[PDB]
């Protein structure tokens, strides 16, 4: 069976930059690979075809290339409408097709700490039973933080869900939720909530006390 | 002139059966192979199926084989994918595509598959405190909750309000309804001057929620 | 609009090369099987070769292998047929398509396998509804093409078939017939290209 292992998962890179996206198949494909671009939202594009062959209207910024069974994407100078996500792909049959997993190519900026806000659950929500707790980071970088959610000191397990926006087109900061979810009940025998976010060498907690405004 | 238009997406309960359709335009889908691909939220494409060109041979992944069937009508210049045994893990954007070196995609249509019922969100405020602790800012929300299926689109102010909003990608709960939040951050002065609306428009329940945010 | 537009026809002599090229535009030649077919003067069509889509295999007919070569250039979206060694029995029209069912075509392009020289047309006036024309004398190879006033006249142009003279060089004639009452104030003009030699000649035809 082909795979189609991609290199970096991830990069970051600045405009103008030299970007290097290698993928590498399990056994040979010949020349029989393409490359894509996408972005959040949007249906793939395709890149290049054959391995090297850039399609047509593709700036050419975009070169493919092989070397046996290693298959590079590079961008010699990166363009902001080139911040996206690329993906290798094998055709060339017995799967018939395999995708590789994927590079993000995200913006560089400097490290950003996040506005961390906790919001109680309304009192509208209480009345129904179920308590919503959220966490905001706000506007911070790089991507990778660990929230988590105390309730009067106790670490919170397997009662919240977090989700992440892409990163900001102005600021390339990105932004992260975190719910914490009990019954009206639990919320009510219990008096501080916090959240706390950890980045490096520093934690930050956003704490609130259930009923002090 | 070359498009590739789907249609067929939608909801349907575990095991049951949905037909994609990819109408093509400006080329005749005889002399070209035709190809399924598939994104669950978060995550990469992986390849459905593929029937060749001319003879219409049909190919399948390992994970839809015995399930799907993809297929051509010639005489309407369309592909199909017809979806049978479908399973929670099959919840997908499905995109049609051309050629082996996939040169034109379709739109992509959402696939859900679930028990759940539909039913649109309840819109809880995420109150800003009147008196700051983050500096001069302050961080205000409506939390989207517990609506069926995917996906909702949120605007603020009916569209007047767009700096600094952040709304999330949904989550799924473990109840099978999804949830999200929707957030800003505002100057904590104009809390006592200017209205924030959250608009949440839900098309799969043909529902919208206006949810007006007031300080706490 | 897809287009398929050929080049590098003409006379070779026996034993001779000549390279077509089939220019592509409107679509990815990657993606398209092109083939190359022929018409020998006034015959049916016949399949030569053949080259596949991605991978680029090759088929040809039997009595052109060893001798013919089909390719394509994807970075210039051209498809080629090298002909070596041509033969008498290799004069035709030939034509290059996409796919199986060949559903675009070039233009076509006339080879000619021979050892006599090219030689350009004569052209005579047939002076004068009144009837007029061009008489297109003693050429070789074919092909010829005939216009009215720089293509302006279309309607009721009658180009005729050449024939081979007992010379071995082409001969024809291309008429047109018109209004009388325009044979004072009109003038015509037959405009007449021999591209293997080179030459067009362009001859005002005038009443008598
Ligand atoms: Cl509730
Ligand atoms: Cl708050
Ligand atoms: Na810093
Ligand atoms: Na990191
Ligand atoms: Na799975
Ligand atoms: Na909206
Ligand atoms: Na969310
Ligand atoms: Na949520
Ligand atoms: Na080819
Ligand atoms: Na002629």
């Given at each position: 069976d082909i795979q189609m292992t991609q290199s970096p998962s991830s990069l970051s890179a600045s405009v103008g930059d030299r970007?290097?996206?290698?993928?590498?198949?399990?056994?040979?494909?010949?020349?029989?690979?393409?490359?894509?671009?996408?972005?959040?939202?949007?249906?793939?594009?395709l890149l290049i075809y054959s391995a090297s062959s850039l399609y047509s209207g593709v700036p050419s910024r975009f070169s493919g290339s092989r070397s046996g069974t290693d298959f590079t994407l590079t961008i010699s100078s990166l363009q902001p409408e080139d911040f996206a996500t690329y993906y290798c792909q094998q055709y060339y049959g017995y799967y018939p097709i395999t995708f590789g997993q994927g590079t993000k190519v995200?913006?560089?900026?400097?490290?950003?700490?996040?506005?961390?806000?906790?919001?109680?659950?309304?009192?509208?929500?209480?009345?129904?039973?179920?308590?919503?707790?959220?966490?905001?980071?706000?506007?911070?970088?790089?991507?990778?933080?660990?929230?988590?959610?105390?309730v009067d000191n106790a670490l919170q397990s397997?009662?919240?869900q977090e989700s992440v926006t892409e990163q900001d087109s102005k600021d390339s900061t990105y932004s992260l939720s975190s719910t914490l979810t009990l019954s009206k009940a639990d919320y009510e025998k219990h008096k501080v909530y916090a959240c706390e976010v950890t980045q490096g060498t520093t934690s930050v907690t956003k704490s609130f006390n259930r009923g002090e405004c | 002139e070359v498009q590739?238009?789907?249609?067929?997406?939608?909801?349907?309960?575990?095991?049951?059966?949905?037909?994609?359709?990819?109408?093509?335009?400006?080329?005749?889908?005889?002399?070209?192979?035709?190809?399924?691909?598939?994104?669950?939220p978060g995550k990469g494409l992986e390849w459905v199926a593929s029937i060749s060109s001319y003879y219409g041979y049909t190919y399948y992944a390992d994970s839809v084989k015995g399930r799907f069937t993809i297929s051509a009508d010639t005489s309407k210049n369309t592909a199909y994918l017809q979806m049978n045994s479908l399973r929670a893990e099959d919840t997908a954007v499905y995109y049609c595509a051309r050629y082996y070196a996939m040169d034109?995609?379709?739109?992509?249509?959402?696939?859900?598959?679930?028990?759940?019922?539909?039913?649109?969100?309840?819109?809880?405020?995420?109150?800003?405190?009147?008196?700051?602790?983050?500096?001069?800012?302050?961080?205000?929300?409506?939390?989207?909750?517990?609506?069926?299926?995917?996906?909702?689109?949120?605007?603020?102010?009916?569209?007047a309000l767009t700096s600094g909003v952040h709304t999330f990608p949904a989550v799924l709960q473990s109840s099978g309804l999804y949830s999200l939040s929707s957030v800003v951050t505002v100057p904590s002065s104009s809390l006592g001057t200017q209205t924030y609306i959250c608009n949440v428009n839900h098309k799969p329940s043909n529902t919208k929620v206006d949810?007006?945010?007031?300080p706490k």
């Open positions: 970007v290097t996206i290698t993928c590498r198949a399990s056994q040979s494909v010949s020349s029989a690979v393409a490359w894509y671009q996408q972005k959040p939202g949007k249906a793939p594009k995200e913006i560089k900026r400097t490290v950003a700490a996040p506005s961390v806000f906790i919001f109680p659950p309304s009192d509208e929500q209480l009345k129904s039973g179920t308590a919503s707790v959220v966490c905001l980071l706000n506007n911070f970088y790089p991507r990778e933080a660990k929230v988590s959610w105390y397997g009662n919240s | 590739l238009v789907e249609s067929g997406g939608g909801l349907v309960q575990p095991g049951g059966s949905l037909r994609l359709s990819c109408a093509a335009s400006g080329f005749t889908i005889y002399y070209s192979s035709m190809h399924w691909v598939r994104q669950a034109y995609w379709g739109q992509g249509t959402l696939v859900t598959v679930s028990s759940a019922s539909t039913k649109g969100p309840s819109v809880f405020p995420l109150a800003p405190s009147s008196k700051s602790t983050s500096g001069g800012t302050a961080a205000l929300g409506c939390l989207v909750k517990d609506y069926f299926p995917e996906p909702v689109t949120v605007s603020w102010n009916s569209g949810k007006k945010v007031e």
